[PDB]
PDB file of C-alpha atoms in Angstrom:
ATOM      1  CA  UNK A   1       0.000   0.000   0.000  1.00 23.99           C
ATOM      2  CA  UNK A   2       1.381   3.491  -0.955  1.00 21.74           C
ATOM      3  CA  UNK A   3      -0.141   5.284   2.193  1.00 22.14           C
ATOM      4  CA  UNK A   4       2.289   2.383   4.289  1.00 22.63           C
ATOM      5  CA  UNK A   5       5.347   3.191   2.440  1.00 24.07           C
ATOM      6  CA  UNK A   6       5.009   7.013   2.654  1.00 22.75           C
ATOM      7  CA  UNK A   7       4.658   6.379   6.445  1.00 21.82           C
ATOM      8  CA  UNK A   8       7.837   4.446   7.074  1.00 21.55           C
ATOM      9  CA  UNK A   9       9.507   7.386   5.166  1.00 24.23           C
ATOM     10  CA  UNK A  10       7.913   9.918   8.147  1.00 24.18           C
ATOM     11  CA  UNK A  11       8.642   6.583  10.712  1.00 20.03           C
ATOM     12  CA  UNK A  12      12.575   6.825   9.537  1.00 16.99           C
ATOM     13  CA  UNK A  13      12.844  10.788   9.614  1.00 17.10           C
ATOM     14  CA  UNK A  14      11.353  11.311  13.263  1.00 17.99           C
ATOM     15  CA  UNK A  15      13.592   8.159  14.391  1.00 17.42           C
ATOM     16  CA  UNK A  16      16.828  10.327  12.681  1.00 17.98           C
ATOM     17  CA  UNK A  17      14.981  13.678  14.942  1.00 19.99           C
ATOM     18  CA  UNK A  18      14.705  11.522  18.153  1.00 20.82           C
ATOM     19  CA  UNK A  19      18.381  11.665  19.578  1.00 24.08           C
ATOM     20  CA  UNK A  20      18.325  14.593  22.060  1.00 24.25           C
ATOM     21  CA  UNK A  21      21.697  16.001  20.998  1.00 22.39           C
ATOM     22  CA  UNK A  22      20.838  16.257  17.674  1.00 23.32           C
ATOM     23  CA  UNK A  23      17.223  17.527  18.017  1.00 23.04           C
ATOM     24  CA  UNK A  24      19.234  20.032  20.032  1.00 24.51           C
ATOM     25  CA  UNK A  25      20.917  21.190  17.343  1.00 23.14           C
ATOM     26  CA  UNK A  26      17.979  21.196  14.723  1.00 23.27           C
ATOM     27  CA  UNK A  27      15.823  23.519  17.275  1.00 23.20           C
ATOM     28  CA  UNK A  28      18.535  25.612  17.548  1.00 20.99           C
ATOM     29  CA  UNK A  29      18.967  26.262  13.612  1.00 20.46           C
ATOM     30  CA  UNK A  30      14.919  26.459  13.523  1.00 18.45           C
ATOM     31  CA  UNK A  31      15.245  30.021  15.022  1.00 21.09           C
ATOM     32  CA  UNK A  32      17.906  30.762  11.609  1.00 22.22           C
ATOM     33  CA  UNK A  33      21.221  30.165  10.809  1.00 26.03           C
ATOM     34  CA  UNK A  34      23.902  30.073  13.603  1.00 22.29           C
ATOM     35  CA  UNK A  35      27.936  29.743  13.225  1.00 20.92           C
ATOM     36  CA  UNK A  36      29.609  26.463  14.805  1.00 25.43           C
ATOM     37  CA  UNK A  37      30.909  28.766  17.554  1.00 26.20           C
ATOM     38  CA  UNK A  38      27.257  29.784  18.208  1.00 24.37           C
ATOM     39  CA  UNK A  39      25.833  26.139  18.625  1.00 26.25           C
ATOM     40  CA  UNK A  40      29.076  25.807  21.161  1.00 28.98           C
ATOM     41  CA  UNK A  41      28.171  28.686  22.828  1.00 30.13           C
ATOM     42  CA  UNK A  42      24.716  27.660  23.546  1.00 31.41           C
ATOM     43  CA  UNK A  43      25.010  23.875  23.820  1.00 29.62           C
ATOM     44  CA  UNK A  44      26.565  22.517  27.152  1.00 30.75           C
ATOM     45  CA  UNK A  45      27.404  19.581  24.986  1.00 34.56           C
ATOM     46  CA  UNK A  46      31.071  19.057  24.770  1.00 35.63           C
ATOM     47  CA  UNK A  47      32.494  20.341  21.141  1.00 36.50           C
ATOM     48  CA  UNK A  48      33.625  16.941  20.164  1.00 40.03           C
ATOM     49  CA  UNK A  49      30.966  15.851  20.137  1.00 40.27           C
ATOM     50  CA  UNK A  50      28.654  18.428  18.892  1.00 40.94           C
ATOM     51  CA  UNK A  51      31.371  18.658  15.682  1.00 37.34           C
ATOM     52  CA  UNK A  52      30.397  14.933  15.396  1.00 38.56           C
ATOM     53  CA  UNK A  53      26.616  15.782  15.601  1.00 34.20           C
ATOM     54  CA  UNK A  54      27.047  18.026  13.127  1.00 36.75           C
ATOM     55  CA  UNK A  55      28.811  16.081  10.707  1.00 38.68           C
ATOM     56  CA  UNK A  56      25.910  13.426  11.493  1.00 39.18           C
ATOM     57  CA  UNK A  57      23.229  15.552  10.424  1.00 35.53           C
ATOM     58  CA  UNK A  58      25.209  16.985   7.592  1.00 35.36           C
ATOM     59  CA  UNK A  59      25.586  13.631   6.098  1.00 34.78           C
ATOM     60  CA  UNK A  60      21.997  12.685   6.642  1.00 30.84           C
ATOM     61  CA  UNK A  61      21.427  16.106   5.010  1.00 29.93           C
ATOM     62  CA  UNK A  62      19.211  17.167   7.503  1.00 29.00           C
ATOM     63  CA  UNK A  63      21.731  20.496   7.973  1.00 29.58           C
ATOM     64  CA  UNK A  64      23.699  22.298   5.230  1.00 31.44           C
ATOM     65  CA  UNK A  65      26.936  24.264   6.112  1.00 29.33           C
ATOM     66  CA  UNK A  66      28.472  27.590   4.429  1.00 27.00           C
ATOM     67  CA  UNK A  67      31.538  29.046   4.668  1.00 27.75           C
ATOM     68  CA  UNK A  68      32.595  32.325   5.248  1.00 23.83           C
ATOM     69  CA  UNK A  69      36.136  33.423   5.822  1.00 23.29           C
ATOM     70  CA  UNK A  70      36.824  31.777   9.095  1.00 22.81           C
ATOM     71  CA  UNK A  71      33.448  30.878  10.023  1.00 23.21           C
ATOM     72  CA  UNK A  72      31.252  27.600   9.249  1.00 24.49           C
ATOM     73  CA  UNK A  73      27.453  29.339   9.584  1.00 23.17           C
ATOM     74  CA  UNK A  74      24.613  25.870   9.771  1.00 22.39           C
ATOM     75  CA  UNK A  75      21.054  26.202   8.670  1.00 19.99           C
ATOM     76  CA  UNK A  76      18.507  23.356   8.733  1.00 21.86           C
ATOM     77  CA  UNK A  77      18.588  22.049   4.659  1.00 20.99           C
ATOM     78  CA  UNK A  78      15.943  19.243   4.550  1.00 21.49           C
ATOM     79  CA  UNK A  79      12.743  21.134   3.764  1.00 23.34           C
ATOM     80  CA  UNK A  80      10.405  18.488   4.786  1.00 25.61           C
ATOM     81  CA  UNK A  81      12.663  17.860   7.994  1.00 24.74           C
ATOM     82  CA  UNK A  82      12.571  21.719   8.654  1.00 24.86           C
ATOM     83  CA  UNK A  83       8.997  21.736   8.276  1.00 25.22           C
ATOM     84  CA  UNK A  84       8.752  19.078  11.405  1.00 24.60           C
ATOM     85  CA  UNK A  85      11.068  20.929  13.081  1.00 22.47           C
ATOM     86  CA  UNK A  86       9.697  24.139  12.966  1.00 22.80           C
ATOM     87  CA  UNK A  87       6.228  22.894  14.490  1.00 25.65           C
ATOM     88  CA  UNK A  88       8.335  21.080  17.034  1.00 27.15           C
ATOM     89  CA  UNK A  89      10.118  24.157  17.712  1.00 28.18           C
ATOM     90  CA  UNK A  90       6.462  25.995  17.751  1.00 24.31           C
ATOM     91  CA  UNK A  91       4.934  23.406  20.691  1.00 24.60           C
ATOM     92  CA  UNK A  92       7.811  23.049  22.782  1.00 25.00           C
ATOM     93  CA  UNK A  93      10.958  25.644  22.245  1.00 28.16           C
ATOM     94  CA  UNK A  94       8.299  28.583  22.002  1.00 30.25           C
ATOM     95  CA  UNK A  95       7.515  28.637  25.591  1.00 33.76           C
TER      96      UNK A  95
ATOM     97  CA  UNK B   1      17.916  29.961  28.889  1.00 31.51           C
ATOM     98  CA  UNK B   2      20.142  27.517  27.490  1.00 36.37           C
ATOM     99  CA  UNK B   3      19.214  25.045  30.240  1.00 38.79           C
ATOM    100  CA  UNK B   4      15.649  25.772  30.046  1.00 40.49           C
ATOM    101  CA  UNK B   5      15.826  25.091  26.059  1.00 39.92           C
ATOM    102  CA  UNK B   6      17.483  21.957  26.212  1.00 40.25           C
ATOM    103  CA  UNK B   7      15.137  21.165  28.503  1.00 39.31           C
ATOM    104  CA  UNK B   8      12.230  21.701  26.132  1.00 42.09           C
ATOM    105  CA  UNK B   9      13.916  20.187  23.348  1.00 44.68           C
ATOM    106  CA  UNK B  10      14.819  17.140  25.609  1.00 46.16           C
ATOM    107  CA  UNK B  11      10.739  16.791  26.034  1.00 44.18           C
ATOM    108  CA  UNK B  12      10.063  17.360  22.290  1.00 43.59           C
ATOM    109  CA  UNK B  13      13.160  14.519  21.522  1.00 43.76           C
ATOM    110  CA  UNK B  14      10.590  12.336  23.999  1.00 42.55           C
ATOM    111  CA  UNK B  15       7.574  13.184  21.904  1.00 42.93           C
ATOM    112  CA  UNK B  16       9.460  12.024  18.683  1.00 43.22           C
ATOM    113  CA  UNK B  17      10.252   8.924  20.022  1.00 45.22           C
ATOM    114  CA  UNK B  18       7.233   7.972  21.082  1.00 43.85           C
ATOM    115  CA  UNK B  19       5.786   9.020  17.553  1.00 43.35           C
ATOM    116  CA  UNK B  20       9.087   7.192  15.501  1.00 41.82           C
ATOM    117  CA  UNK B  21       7.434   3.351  15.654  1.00 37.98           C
ATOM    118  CA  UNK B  22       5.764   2.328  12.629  1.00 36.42           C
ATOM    119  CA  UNK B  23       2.563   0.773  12.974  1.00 30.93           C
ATOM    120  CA  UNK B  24       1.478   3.335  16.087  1.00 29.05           C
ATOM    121  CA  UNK B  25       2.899   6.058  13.559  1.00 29.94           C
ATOM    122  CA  UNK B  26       0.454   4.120  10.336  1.00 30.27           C
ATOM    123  CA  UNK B  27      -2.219   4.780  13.164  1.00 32.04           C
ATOM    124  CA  UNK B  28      -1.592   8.891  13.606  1.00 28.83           C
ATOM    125  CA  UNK B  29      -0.993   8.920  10.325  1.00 30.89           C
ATOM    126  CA  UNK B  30      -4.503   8.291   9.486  1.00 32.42           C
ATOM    127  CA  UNK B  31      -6.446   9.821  12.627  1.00 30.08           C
ATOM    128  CA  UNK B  32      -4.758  12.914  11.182  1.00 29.75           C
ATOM    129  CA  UNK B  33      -7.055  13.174   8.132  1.00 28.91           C
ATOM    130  CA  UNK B  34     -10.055  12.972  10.702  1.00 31.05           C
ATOM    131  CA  UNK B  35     -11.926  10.288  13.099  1.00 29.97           C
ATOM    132  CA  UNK B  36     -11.316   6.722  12.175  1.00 30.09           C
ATOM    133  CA  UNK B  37     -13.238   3.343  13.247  1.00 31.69           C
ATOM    134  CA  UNK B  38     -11.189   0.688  14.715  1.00 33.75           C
ATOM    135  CA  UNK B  39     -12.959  -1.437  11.889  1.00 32.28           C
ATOM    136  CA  UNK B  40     -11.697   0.526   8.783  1.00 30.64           C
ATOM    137  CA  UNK B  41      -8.121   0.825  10.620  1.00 30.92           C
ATOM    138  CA  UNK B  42      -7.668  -2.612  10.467  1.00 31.05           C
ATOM    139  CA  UNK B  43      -8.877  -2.829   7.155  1.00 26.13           C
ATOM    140  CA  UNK B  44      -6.602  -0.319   5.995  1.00 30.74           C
ATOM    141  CA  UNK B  45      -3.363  -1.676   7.923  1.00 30.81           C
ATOM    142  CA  UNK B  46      -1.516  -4.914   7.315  1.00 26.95           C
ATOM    143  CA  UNK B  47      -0.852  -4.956  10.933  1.00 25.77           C
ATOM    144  CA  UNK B  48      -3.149  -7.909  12.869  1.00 26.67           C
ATOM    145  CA  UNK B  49      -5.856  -7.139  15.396  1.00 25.38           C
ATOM    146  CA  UNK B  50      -3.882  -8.493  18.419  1.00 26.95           C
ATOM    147  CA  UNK B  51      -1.328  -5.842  17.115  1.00 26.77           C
ATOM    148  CA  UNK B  52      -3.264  -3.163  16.292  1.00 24.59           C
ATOM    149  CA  UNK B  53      -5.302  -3.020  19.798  1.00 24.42           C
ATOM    150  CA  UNK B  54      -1.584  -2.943  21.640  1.00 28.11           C
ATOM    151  CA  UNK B  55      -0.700  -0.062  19.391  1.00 29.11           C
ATOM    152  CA  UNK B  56      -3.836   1.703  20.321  1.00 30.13           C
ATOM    153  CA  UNK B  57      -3.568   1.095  24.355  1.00 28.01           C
ATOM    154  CA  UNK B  58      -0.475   2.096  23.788  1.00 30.17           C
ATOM    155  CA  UNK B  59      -1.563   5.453  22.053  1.00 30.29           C
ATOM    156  CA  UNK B  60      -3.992   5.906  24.631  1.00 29.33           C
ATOM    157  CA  UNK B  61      -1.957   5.766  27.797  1.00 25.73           C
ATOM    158  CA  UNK B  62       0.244   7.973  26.426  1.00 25.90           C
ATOM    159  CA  UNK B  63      -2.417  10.578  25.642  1.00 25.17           C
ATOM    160  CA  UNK B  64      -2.131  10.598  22.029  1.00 23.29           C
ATOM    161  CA  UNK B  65      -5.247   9.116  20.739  1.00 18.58           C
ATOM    162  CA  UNK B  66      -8.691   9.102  22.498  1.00 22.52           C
ATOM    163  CA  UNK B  67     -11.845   7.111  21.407  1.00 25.29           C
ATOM    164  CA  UNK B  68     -15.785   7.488  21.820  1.00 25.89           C
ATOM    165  CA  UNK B  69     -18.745   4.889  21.478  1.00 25.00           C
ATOM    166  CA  UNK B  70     -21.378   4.561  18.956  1.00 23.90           C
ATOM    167  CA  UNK B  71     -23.166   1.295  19.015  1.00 23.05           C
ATOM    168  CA  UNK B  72     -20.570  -0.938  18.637  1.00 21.85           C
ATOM    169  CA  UNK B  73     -18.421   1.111  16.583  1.00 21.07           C
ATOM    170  CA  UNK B  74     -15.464   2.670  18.350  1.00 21.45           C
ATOM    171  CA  UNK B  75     -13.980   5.534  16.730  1.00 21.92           C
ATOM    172  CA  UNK B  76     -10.797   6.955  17.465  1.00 23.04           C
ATOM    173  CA  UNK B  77      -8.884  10.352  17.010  1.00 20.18           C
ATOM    174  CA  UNK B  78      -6.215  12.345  18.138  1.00 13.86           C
ATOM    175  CA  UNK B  79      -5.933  13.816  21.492  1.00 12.25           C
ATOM    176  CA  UNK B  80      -3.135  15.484  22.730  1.00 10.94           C
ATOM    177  CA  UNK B  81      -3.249  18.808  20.549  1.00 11.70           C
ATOM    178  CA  UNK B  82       0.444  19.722  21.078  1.00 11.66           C
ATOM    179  CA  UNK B  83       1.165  15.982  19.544  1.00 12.42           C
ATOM    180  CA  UNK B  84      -1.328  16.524  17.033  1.00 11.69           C
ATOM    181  CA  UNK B  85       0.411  19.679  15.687  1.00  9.16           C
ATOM    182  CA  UNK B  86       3.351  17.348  15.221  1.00  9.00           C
ATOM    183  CA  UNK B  87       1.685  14.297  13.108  1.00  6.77           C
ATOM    184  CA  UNK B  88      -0.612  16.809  11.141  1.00  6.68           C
ATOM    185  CA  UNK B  89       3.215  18.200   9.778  1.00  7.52           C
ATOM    186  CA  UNK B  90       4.073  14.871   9.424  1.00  6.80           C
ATOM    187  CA  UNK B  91       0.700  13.870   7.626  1.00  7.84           C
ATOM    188  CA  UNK B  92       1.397  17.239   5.443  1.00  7.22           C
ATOM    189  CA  UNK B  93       4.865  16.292   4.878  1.00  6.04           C
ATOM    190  CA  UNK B  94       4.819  13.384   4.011  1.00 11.01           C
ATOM    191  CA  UNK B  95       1.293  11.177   3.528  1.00  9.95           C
ATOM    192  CA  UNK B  96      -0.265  13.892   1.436  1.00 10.50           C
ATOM    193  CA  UNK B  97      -0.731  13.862  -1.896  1.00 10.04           C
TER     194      UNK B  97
END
């Protein structure tokens, strides 16, 4: 059945969002782009491993990276993703 | 703060897992085009009736999906409106046509 398929494709996206680090990260970007110092800054996770988090979620393409100069700036890149993670970001990161 | 906004998105990682399973997920999926029987859910899902009653006590107790009486028809429907937000993206993002 086609409406089964299309829901294992939402089943394996929200099990990729469901890891609290990197859900972390996602409703972090949901508010707009932020630099990899920026995500340090405001995640008590240590940098090692929110560099690894990032490359995670950079290879799943669920985040894109630029550069600029010095700087690596992150923005959400999955639209579909974003669009979960923005209403996730609306119910529970909005007070 | 920072602590207070991991702490939300520590909650909203719980919410996610409880919605990442398949056939409970198969289940919001369709409540979120509007009320569904019991009867035409397990007609629609290749999941078996033992199965498909422990996905929806399951549902249940965790607030997601609440159900009403008529006759002997049970229907069943979202509850929890922050969780329905959620699945209705979901349903929007990815079930729709």
């Amino acid at each position: 059945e086609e409406m089964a398929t299309r829901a294992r494709a939402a089943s394996n996206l929200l099990k990729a969002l469901a890891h609290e680090g990197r859900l972390m990260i996602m409703c972090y970007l949901a508010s707009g782009e932020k630099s990899v110092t920026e995500l340090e800054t405001r995640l008590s996770t240590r940098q090692a491993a929110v560099s690894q988090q990032l490359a995670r979620l950079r290879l799943e393409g669920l985040v894109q990276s630029r550069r600029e100069g010095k700087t690596i700036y992150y923005s959400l890149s999955d639209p579909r993703a974003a669009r979960v993670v923005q209403t996730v970001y609306e119910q529970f990161c909005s007070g």
